[PDB]
Motif scaffolding. Structure first.
Motif, PDB file in Angstrom:
ATOM      1  N   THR B 387      21.564   7.628 -46.750  1.00 16.04           N
ATOM      2  CA  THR B 387      21.024   8.925 -46.387  1.00 16.04           C
ATOM      3  C   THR B 387      20.283   8.795 -45.059  1.00 16.04           C
ATOM      4  O   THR B 387      19.347   8.008 -44.949  1.00 16.04           O
ATOM      5  N   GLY B 388      20.714   9.571 -44.059  1.00 18.02           N
ATOM      6  CA  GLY B 388      20.008   9.671 -42.793  1.00 18.02           C
ATOM      7  C   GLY B 388      19.113  10.908 -42.765  1.00 18.02           C
ATOM      8  O   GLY B 388      19.552  11.993 -43.141  1.00 18.02           O
ATOM      9  N   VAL B 389      17.859  10.725 -42.334  1.00 22.42           N
ATOM     10  CA  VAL B 389      16.923  11.822 -42.147  1.00 22.42           C
ATOM     11  C   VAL B 389      16.564  11.880 -40.664  1.00 22.42           C
ATOM     12  O   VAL B 389      16.216  10.859 -40.076  1.00 22.42           O
ATOM     13  N   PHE B 390      16.651  13.078 -40.069  1.00 21.60           N
ATOM     14  CA  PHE B 390      16.563  13.225 -38.623  1.00 21.60           C
ATOM     15  C   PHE B 390      15.692  14.421 -38.252  1.00 21.60           C
ATOM     16  O   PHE B 390      15.782  15.481 -38.872  1.00 21.60           O
ATOM     17  N   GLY B 391      14.875  14.230 -37.209  1.00 21.89           N
ATOM     18  CA  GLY B 391      14.102  15.299 -36.600  1.00 21.89           C
ATOM     19  C   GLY B 391      12.614  15.129 -36.886  1.00 21.89           C
ATOM     20  O   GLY B 391      12.239  14.749 -37.993  1.00 21.89           O
ATOM     21  N   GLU B 392      11.779  15.427 -35.883  1.00 24.46           N
ATOM     22  CA  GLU B 392      10.332  15.380 -36.034  1.00 24.46           C
ATOM     23  C   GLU B 392       9.891  16.293 -37.177  1.00 24.46           C
ATOM     24  O   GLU B 392       8.886  16.016 -37.827  1.00 24.46           O
ATOM     25  N   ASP B 393      10.658  17.360 -37.437  1.00 24.91           N
ATOM     26  CA  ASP B 393      10.329  18.319 -38.481  1.00 24.91           C
ATOM     27  C   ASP B 393      10.456  17.709 -39.880  1.00 24.91           C
ATOM     28  O   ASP B 393      10.053  18.334 -40.859  1.00 24.91           O
ATOM     29  N   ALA B 394      11.025  16.503 -39.984  1.00 22.57           N
ATOM     30  CA  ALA B 394      11.065  15.784 -41.249  1.00 22.57           C
ATOM     31  C   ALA B 394       9.761  15.025 -41.492  1.00 22.57           C
ATOM     32  O   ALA B 394       9.441  14.711 -42.635  1.00 22.57           O
ATOM     33  N   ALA B 449      14.577   7.291 -41.580  1.00 23.90           N
ATOM     34  CA  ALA B 449      14.106   8.538 -40.999  1.00 23.90           C
ATOM     35  C   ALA B 449      13.786   8.338 -39.520  1.00 23.90           C
ATOM     36  O   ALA B 449      12.870   7.592 -39.182  1.00 23.90           O
ATOM     37  N   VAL B 450      14.552   9.018 -38.657  1.00 27.94           N
ATOM     38  CA  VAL B 450      14.300   9.052 -37.224  1.00 27.94           C
ATOM     39  C   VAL B 450      13.637  10.388 -36.896  1.00 27.94           C
ATOM     40  O   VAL B 450      14.306  11.417 -36.857  1.00 27.94           O
ATOM     41  N   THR B 451      12.319  10.357 -36.653  1.00 35.88           N
ATOM     42  CA  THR B 451      11.520  11.571 -36.555  1.00 35.88           C
ATOM     43  C   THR B 451      10.950  11.728 -35.144  1.00 35.88           C
ATOM     44  O   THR B 451       9.884  12.315 -34.966  1.00 35.88           O
ATOM     45  N   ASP B 452      11.683  11.211 -34.150  1.00 33.96           N
ATOM     46  CA  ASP B 452      11.420  11.454 -32.741  1.00 33.96           C
ATOM     47  C   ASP B 452      12.659  12.121 -32.148  1.00 33.96           C
ATOM     48  O   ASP B 452      13.710  11.493 -32.050  1.00 33.96           O
ATOM     49  N   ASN B 453      12.522  13.389 -31.738  1.00 35.62           N
ATOM     50  CA  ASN B 453      13.659  14.185 -31.299  1.00 35.62           C
ATOM     51  C   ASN B 453      14.268  13.620 -30.014  1.00 35.62           C
ATOM     52  O   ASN B 453      15.387  13.985 -29.659  1.00 35.62           O
ATOM     53  N   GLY B 454      13.542  12.724 -29.331  1.00 39.97           N
ATOM     54  CA  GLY B 454      14.033  12.088 -28.118  1.00 39.97           C
ATOM     55  C   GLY B 454      14.856  10.827 -28.387  1.00 39.97           C
ATOM     56  O   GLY B 454      15.549  10.347 -27.490  1.00 39.97           O
ATOM     57  N   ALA B 455      14.781  10.290 -29.615  1.00 42.03           N
ATOM     58  CA  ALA B 455      15.410   9.018 -29.941  1.00 42.03           C
ATOM     59  C   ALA B 455      16.867   9.232 -30.347  1.00 42.03           C
ATOM     60  O   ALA B 455      17.261   8.884 -31.459  1.00 42.03           O
ATOM     61  N   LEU B 456      17.667   9.772 -29.421  1.00 40.15           N
ATOM     62  CA  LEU B 456      19.018  10.219 -29.728  1.00 40.15           C
ATOM     63  C   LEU B 456      19.950   9.024 -29.930  1.00 40.15           C
ATOM     64  O   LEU B 456      20.910   9.121 -30.691  1.00 40.15           O
ATOM     65  N   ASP B 457      19.668   7.902 -29.253  1.00 36.93           N
ATOM     66  CA  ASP B 457      20.421   6.672 -29.462  1.00 36.93           C
ATOM     67  C   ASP B 457      20.342   6.262 -30.930  1.00 36.93           C
ATOM     68  O   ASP B 457      21.361   5.968 -31.552  1.00 36.93           O
ATOM     69  N   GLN B 458      19.118   6.251 -31.469  1.00 38.76           N
ATOM     70  CA  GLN B 458      18.885   5.825 -32.841  1.00 38.76           C
ATOM     71  C   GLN B 458      19.567   6.787 -33.815  1.00 38.76           C
ATOM     72  O   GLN B 458      20.060   6.363 -34.858  1.00 38.76           O
ATOM     73  N   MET B 459      19.601   8.080 -33.469  1.00 37.07           N
ATOM     74  CA  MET B 459      20.201   9.079 -34.340  1.00 37.07           C
ATOM     75  C   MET B 459      21.712   8.864 -34.431  1.00 37.07           C
ATOM     76  O   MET B 459      22.276   8.933 -35.520  1.00 37.07           O
ATOM     77  N   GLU B 460      22.353   8.598 -33.287  1.00 38.66           N
ATOM     78  CA  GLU B 460      23.759   8.222 -33.257  1.00 38.66           C
ATOM     79  C   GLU B 460      23.997   7.018 -34.165  1.00 38.66           C
ATOM     80  O   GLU B 460      24.903   7.036 -34.993  1.00 38.66           O
TER      81      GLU B 460
ATOM     82  N   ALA C   1      13.229   2.854 -39.386  1.00 38.94           N
ATOM     83  CA  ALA C   1      12.786   1.526 -39.782  1.00 38.94           C
ATOM     84  C   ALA C   1      13.466   0.448 -38.937  1.00 38.94           C
ATOM     85  O   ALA C   1      12.839  -0.553 -38.601  1.00 38.94           O
ATOM     86  N   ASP C   2      14.742   0.664 -38.589  1.00 38.21           N
ATOM     87  CA  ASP C   2      15.507  -0.299 -37.810  1.00 38.21           C
ATOM     88  C   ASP C   2      15.765   0.231 -36.400  1.00 38.21           C
ATOM     89  O   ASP C   2      16.776  -0.110 -35.789  1.00 38.21           O
ATOM     90  N   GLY C   3      14.825   1.027 -35.875  1.00 42.00           N
ATOM     91  CA  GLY C   3      15.014   1.728 -34.614  1.00 42.00           C
ATOM     92  C   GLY C   3      14.848   0.825 -33.393  1.00 42.00           C
ATOM     93  O   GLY C   3      15.265   1.196 -32.297  1.00 42.00           O
ATOM     94  N   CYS C   4      14.210  -0.339 -33.575  1.00 45.85           N
ATOM     95  CA  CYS C   4      14.007  -1.292 -32.495  1.00 45.85           C
ATOM     96  C   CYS C   4      14.872  -2.521 -32.751  1.00 45.85           C
ATOM     97  O   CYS C   4      14.774  -3.130 -33.815  1.00 45.85           O
ATOM     98  N   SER C   5      15.720  -2.876 -31.778  1.00 46.66           N
ATOM     99  CA  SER C   5      16.640  -3.987 -31.953  1.00 46.66           C
ATOM    100  C   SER C   5      15.845  -5.277 -32.143  1.00 46.66           C
ATOM    101  O   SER C   5      14.941  -5.575 -31.362  1.00 46.66           O
ATOM    102  N   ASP C   6      16.175  -6.003 -33.219  1.00 51.44           N
ATOM    103  CA  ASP C   6      15.517  -7.248 -33.583  1.00 51.44           C
ATOM    104  C   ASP C   6      14.027  -7.007 -33.827  1.00 51.44           C
ATOM    105  O   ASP C   6      13.225  -7.918 -33.645  1.00 51.44           O
ATOM    106  N   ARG C   7      13.682  -5.783 -34.255  1.00 48.34           N
ATOM    107  CA  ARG C   7      12.312  -5.382 -34.544  1.00 48.34           C
ATOM    108  C   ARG C   7      11.407  -5.573 -33.323  1.00 48.34           C
ATOM    109  O   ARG C   7      10.216  -5.836 -33.477  1.00 48.34           O
ATOM    110  N   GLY C   8      11.959  -5.387 -32.118  1.00 45.76           N
ATOM    111  CA  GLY C   8      11.243  -5.667 -30.882  1.00 45.76           C
ATOM    112  C   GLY C   8      10.354  -4.502 -30.450  1.00 45.76           C
ATOM    113  O   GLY C   8      10.505  -3.983 -29.347  1.00 45.76           O
TER     114      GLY C   8
END
Ligand SMILES: OC[C@H]1NC[C@H](O)[C@@H](O)[C@@H]1O
Ligand SMILES: OC[C@H]1NC[C@H](O)[C@@H](O)[C@@H]1O
Ligand SMILES: [Mg+2]
Ligand SMILES: [Mg+2]
Ligand SMILES: [Mg+2]
Ligand SMILES: [Mg+2]
Ligand SMILES: [Mg+2]
Ligand SMILES: [Mg+2]
Lengths: 781, 781, 215
Positions: B387-394, B449-460, C1-8
């Protein structure tokens, strides 16, 4: 709780001496008015209701428009096409009467050109009790003599230009905390009354009142009473303050306005010495008060004639033009309501009043630079192989020079503090700009500017390569209605802002020829870096206004030898200066109680009393040359004995115990003329010494005369005189001044007069409060 | 300029029917009072001068304390240990009378426990003229019937709990711009008067007034007149508005208070129908006005008795306890001024009034979830592999749930708008929290949970691995005194905040099972993504209060089938809704002129009139089951013909033309009882249909009854009735309602009465304003 | 939780250091989540989480009202190929990260029942606040992996009595531990020479030898 004794009635004008012409014309004018028209003069129109920061009511019947009262102490606030002059603290650092006068004239000319009637400045209150007081920079110096003299010169300048000056804030407004209950509540404090500054009679006379006496004697047209209380009576309804001290003892002939929304006892304030209510309820109550006989006819008549006396004194009748700008918009046109419908009127004419005032602004900038350290760092040539420039304080405000309202930020180079004491930059030359221009016009070596205090990697990188590194740091403060980074007007600490200290340390670690430039509103704690051997020079430049970068490089690159002297002490710690600001209510929900227990012992007097060594003492500053002092001589002048004032006023003319008494009143012993009993200004001694430039370039020296009054409770030394003198290599001059009776006196509460005490007095002439090169006894007679 | 005709005298109470007991007791109390004591009831004590948002003066002689008036429509503002209920707009989305009532009861209970006398809510003004109106979320729906019904239920709930409710704001406060001149000036506009809502008589009656009529008939104790003008008369001194419409036609028996500092003609306002001045001059002027005869004795008597009648009606005599919290501090103790010195008093008792109210908050949360799209996305199981959770609103407000004063920010999950319409969260359950709990208590699959709307790399990164992606987006608004990101109360656009649309686009590009959850104060533009095939479901969840996350997952994971219907329209463009907000002054420095030229055609009426197809129409919502409509039947009821009201009032009792007339007055044709002529509520037709659950799970349907009034200037359809009904698989129910005379009438300005026009009327029953499954003629008689 | 590569990075709760010595969290239960779960399943009192170390005003505001204040601070490190905030694997100091010390001081000044929870890769300097009387308890929780929040509340709320012992010394100063890292080359362009002159006297052996009393 401290208590303020009553003093009634409120003195009426005598119109003696240099006020006679103005009094005559004021009487002629006020004689023609109804009661309503008279009250109009005393009544503000309301907040933001017209064009100026404050306006009085009009008298259309005679074609008399309401008066326009406009900030600030350092320029024309809000208006376009005006100049941004150096702050008052910079003027203090010049120690230059002439520059203070010329600044006043230039400011006065700009106000005049915009149609302003009253410039709301200059400032001697706050004096500078605390190093971290928010608004000190608007004034001059903690020293009452340096402040008083330059206050007086500024006033003469403004008024010679045909604008009414306004001595503010009277009195005891030495901090921003708790100045107004509403404001305190906004910061999360539960109080319902402004702080009470509790100041004894002797402290007032010998410290805070002294410069205001100078302002009265200089012929200042108006006063502004302060937000705070003094001895638990609001300044604007404090009869001791306005009636006794100001209008009896100091014999002020002008008018007193309130600070904006300053609390007073309504109609009662008029009886206590208030003449004008700003910004604006009062009008109709004062009218009713006159009709029912609570306020005498002679009182309102005196309020009106005081206002009109100031008007005629500076020649508003000749110099008044229509108000050609709007404080509240830059729009050319706007709407105004009429009896029926609305009128579309011209509101901004964009009248350019700047003239050649950039010149004096550049000059005062250069004159206010204080060289604190120089181990072979300065001057620079402009032929350096690589110049690094460091710190955000070198760079631009990215939002524009005027991008922060009331300068309420610390973006880029600091050239002005925040609050009402502001004006808009027509432009702002940054250090970054001036230094690059200097280099690219001369040797054309390398130059880089790192203006992000976080970019320590780059600072390292660049500083490692530099022939010279020029580091810029600042510290800001201002009026209490603005909070920047937890500084509620007053400074929360004496630290450099935005990690300035880390900038200095980083650069000094990588460059053994690091110059530090401080743009600060007052002192900061520099103990951790000032003695770093990689720091080859230190200057304080203060708040230089629009020509900051240019005025600085003039000094750094040796076109102008620095001759400024620090107008306050640079201590090792905050504790060095004395007790903290009162920033926590100490009277529950009531007026916080601020006891001025230190008395006259503020700034250098404090350091002297406790035998503490400052890093840089009051009156200290270096030069690109050296000066030698020799051959002091004291000449007794055998003045006439001091005579306490006697006789009575005339009865109050028409054109609380004692409050309605219009019968002849006894003159106070220390009163009799504007600024006090004239015998106070009799010259007692003439003191002279020879100053010589013994070095290789032309430079300015600020010789200083200090007196030891010799009593157990007296400061070791107090400043009494000073000048700024230009001397070429090998040039000598005879510096000669006189000590007045006031200069060698103490205030005696018992007799209510200035007394020359029996203790032996000593006079000193030196280059600072600590570098007392010459001394002689003052022989009694 | 639009003009507001005068209507005097100000009607006095009848105290008939449901108000008889209250009036009798109010008379008995007020008969004992002095003039000063009566006036005290009408006078606020001043801004922040006591404990509550507003307080009246007291009558200590009879041990009667000042009334405590407290925000908000969704809870107890400022106080600690209270609940944060879902916003009014969420209540509207439930279409659930019972839930509206139970929320009112719970809120009233909390106010009661704190000692509050008047809850400042609920809201039917703004109704929702503009989709970008800042405070719409505080009310219910742009539809007058949905708002009126749920408004009435809310009021009944509050007052049954023993607190006085306050219908606000009356009337025409449909935007925040220019509501108050001082506020507009703060935003750089040069106006001296509030905007004028220019609304014709027909539009008032058929739209904006309608829900307020419901409020009156529901027995609401108080009204609040609005900041704005109506036809160039301030609501709080608009005699047509207060004396005619409210107190004659609608025959309101309670009291009218001003909005806080709402402009009015002082003593003149009393004659025009104002009863209470908040937050509090008025007292003195009113006393003087009575003594000198400018305000009749019967007027002040009527003011007092209306206030006391409201007090007795809800049983404040029984339920009143001391005010046990302080609005202005969370501190337990605080200093207070005494006759002598000061006291240190308990100001906060920390009384926990939350009870079990978290239950109804979670329930209303779940019930207000509207399923707008579902192509096999929902429900989830909790056994998904990833389960992916996305958006600062989460996510969480990083400053704490109550980290923004008055909720004046969009930090983390949006569960409440900003301004006065707020309360402090005791806690806030975020979607992030609730979703992780769901997974970790069930299948224990992967969850991030990716709750930074700018972190689009992580969301992908995360989305491309996910079994399901749950995306959270919001849009916020509130009262005009708060500006968030250029939204001056009103929304500057209908875009998702903080790059929400880019979040959706990024996730949907990487996950073919994307669920979108919208927490919005109103509609946003979704045209670019709603029809994305990778978006398998869309829900609107609004502003759910403290249980947001839990109420959501109950729906998402299938414990509750979604049964909400959107209470406003989701259009393709802003232009779909009609004309923009008036955000630029159009009357120079005078009152901006805001013409309601669209008449009754707001929201779905506008879409229908102009044949704009909504993306999601008013009244639309999906379910986890299906429903079938069949067998409409119309029964004419042969009601008594309508008789215009006639006869006279009593003469005004004691205990501008006509302003002092206390003689018997003619009853208005459409008046005669609270809510209007009782004949208006005669049942004209009974209408039934059969609803069947044809799917495989229990679910709620909201059947809707619409009427076509049949004229050329009538909406194609107007909502007239609704219910929320639970049906098990295969279960049927007969939904039977009645249409009143009001329901099928139009307002006739000439005759000043409701008329059933000769145009043929049609009734529709369906599942939305567009999905009109059944219809029948309404045969005339 | 895994948003930073190698937890960096040091984003949010620290439950793992950075570099090759890592794995991806299937999920991460935060202290925020576990504590709210604990309260809302039991007494259902008020609970608020201020998780921005710069939001000091809000921390005062909330700490002022609290029966108990639970403060979270961390310090991170890892393998040399990742540089976080000037920490080139090795730590550039023994300070709490992101102004953790100022968080502690602010909360403790407004709440006389402050609990401090430290998630650190190793010792940090705590001399300025450990002895503060408003700090009624201090725990080190280290790098607990995916169940961090749950494992913590199990101890905090008394289901498990804490029985761990610190596996390294907590000294008053960095100098307490002995000589600094070798962080500038000392053999020109050749191999830096790192002499282990202290011998067996590392950590507590060193403290004991020089009669330095650990905190
Ligand atoms: O802006 C007008 C007035 N505001 C208040 C300030 O204290 C005073 O210095 C200033 O002149
Ligand atoms: O806060 C009191 C009052 N302020 C003004 C708002 O318009 C109103 O809704 C509220 O009740
Ligand atoms: Mg104007
Ligand atoms: Mg000039
Ligand atoms: Mg005199
Ligand atoms: Mg209070
Ligand atoms: Mg209950
Ligand atoms: Mg009636």
């Amino acid at each position: 709780l401290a208590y303020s004794p009553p003093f009634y009635p409120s003195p009426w004008m005598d119109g003696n001496g240099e006020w006679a012409e103005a009094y005559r014309r004021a009487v002629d004018f006020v004689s023609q008015l109804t009661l309503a028209e008279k009250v109009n003069l005393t009544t503000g129109v309301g907040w933001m209701q017209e064009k100026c920061v404050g306006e009085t009511g009009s008298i259309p019947r005679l074609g008399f428009r309401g008066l326009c009262l406009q900030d600030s102490p350092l320029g024309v606030r809000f208006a376009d096409y005006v100049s941004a002059f150096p702050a008052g603290v910079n003027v203090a650092a010049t120690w230059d009467k002439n520059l203070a006068y010329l600044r006043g004239k230039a400011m006065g000319e700009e106000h005049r050109g915009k149609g302003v009637d009253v410039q709301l400045g200059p400032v001697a209150g706050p004096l500078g009790r605390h190093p971290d007081g928010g608004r000190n920079w608007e004034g001059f110096s903690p020293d009452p003599v340096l402040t008083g003299v330059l206050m007086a010169e500024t006033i003469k300048g403004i008024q010679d230009a045909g604008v009414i000056a306004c001595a503010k804030h009277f009195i005891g407004n030495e901090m921003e905390h708790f100045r107004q209950a509403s404001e305190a509540v906004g910061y999360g404090f539960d109080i319902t009354e402004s702080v009470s500054s509790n100041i004894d009679d002797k402290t007032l006379h010998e410290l805070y009142l002294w410069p205001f006496a100078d302002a009265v004697r200089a012929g200042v047209g108006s006063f502004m009473c302060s937000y705070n209380q003094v001895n638990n009576s609001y300044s604007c309804s404090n009869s001791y303050l306005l009636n006794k001290l100001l209008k009896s003892e100091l014999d002020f002939q002008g008018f007193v306005m309130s600070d904006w929304g300053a609390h007073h006892s309504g109609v009662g304030a008029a009886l206590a010495g208030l003449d004008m209510s700003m910004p604006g309820f009062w009008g109709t109550n004062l009218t009713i008060a006159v009709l029912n006989g609570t306020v005498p006819e002679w009182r309102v008549d005196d309020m009106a004639v005081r206002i009109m006396a100031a008007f005629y004194k500076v020649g508003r009748d000749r110099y008044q033009v229509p108000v050609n700008f709007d404080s509240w918009t830059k729009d050319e046109y706007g709407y105004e309501h009429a009896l029926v419908g609305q009128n579309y009127v011209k509101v901004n004419d964009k009248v350019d009043v700047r003239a050649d005032h950039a010149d004096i602004i550049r000059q005062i900038g250069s004159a206010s630079v204080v060289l604190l350290k120089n181990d072979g760092g300065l001057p620079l040539t402009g032929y350096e192989k690589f110049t690094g420039v460091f710190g955000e304080d070198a760079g631009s405000n990215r939002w524009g020079a005027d991008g922060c309202s009331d300068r309420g930020c610390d973006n880029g180079t600091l050239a002005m503090g925040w609050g009402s004491g502001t004006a808009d930059f027509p432009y702002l030359v940054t250090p970054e700009q001036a230094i690059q221009n200097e280099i690219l016009s001369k040797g054309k070596g390398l130059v880089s500017a790192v203006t992000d205090n976080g970019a320590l990697d780059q600072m390292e990188q660049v500083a490692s390569q530099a022939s010279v590194s020029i580091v810029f740091v600042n510290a800001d403060s201002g009026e209490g209605y603005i909070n920047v980074d937890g500084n509620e007007g007053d400074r929360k600490n004496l630290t450099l802002w935005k990690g300035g200290e880390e900038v200095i340390k980083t650069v000094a670690a990588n460059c053994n020829n690091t110059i530090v430039v401080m743009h600060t509103v007052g002192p900061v704690l520099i103990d951790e870096w000032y003695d770093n051997p990689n720091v080859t020079a230190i200057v304080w430049a203060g708040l230089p206004g629009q020509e900051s970068g240019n005025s600085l490089v003039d000094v750094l690159y040796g076109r102008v030898s620095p001759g400024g002297k620090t107008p306050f002490t640079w201590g090792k710690t905050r504790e060095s200066y004395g007790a903290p600001l009162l920033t926590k209510p100490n009277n529950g929900k009531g007026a916080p109680q601020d006891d001025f227990t230190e008395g006259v012992f503020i700034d250098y007097r404090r350091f002297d009393k406790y035998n503490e060594t400052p890093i840089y003492e009051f009156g200290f500053g270096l030069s690109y040359t050296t000066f030698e002092y020799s051959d002091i001589y004291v000449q007794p002048l055998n003045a006439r004995p001091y005579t306490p004032a006697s006789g009575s006023t005339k009865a109050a003319p028409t054109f609380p115990s004692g409050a309605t008494d219009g019968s002849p009143q006894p003159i106070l012993p220390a009163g009799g003329a504007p600024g006090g009993n004239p015998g106070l200004y009799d010259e007692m001694y003439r003191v002279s010494a020879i100053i010589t430039n013994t070095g290789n370039v032309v430079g300015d020296e600020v010789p200083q005369l200090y007196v030891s009054l010799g009593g157990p409770d007296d400061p070791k030394v107090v400043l009494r005189n000073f000048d700024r003198i230009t001397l070429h290599p090998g040039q000598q001059t005879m510096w000669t001044t006189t000590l007045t009776r006031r200069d060698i006196s103490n205030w005696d509460p018992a007799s209510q007069n200035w007394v020359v005490t029996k203790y032996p007095k000593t006079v000193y002439i030196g280059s600072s409060s600590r570098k007392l090169h010459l001394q002689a006894p003052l022989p009694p007679y």
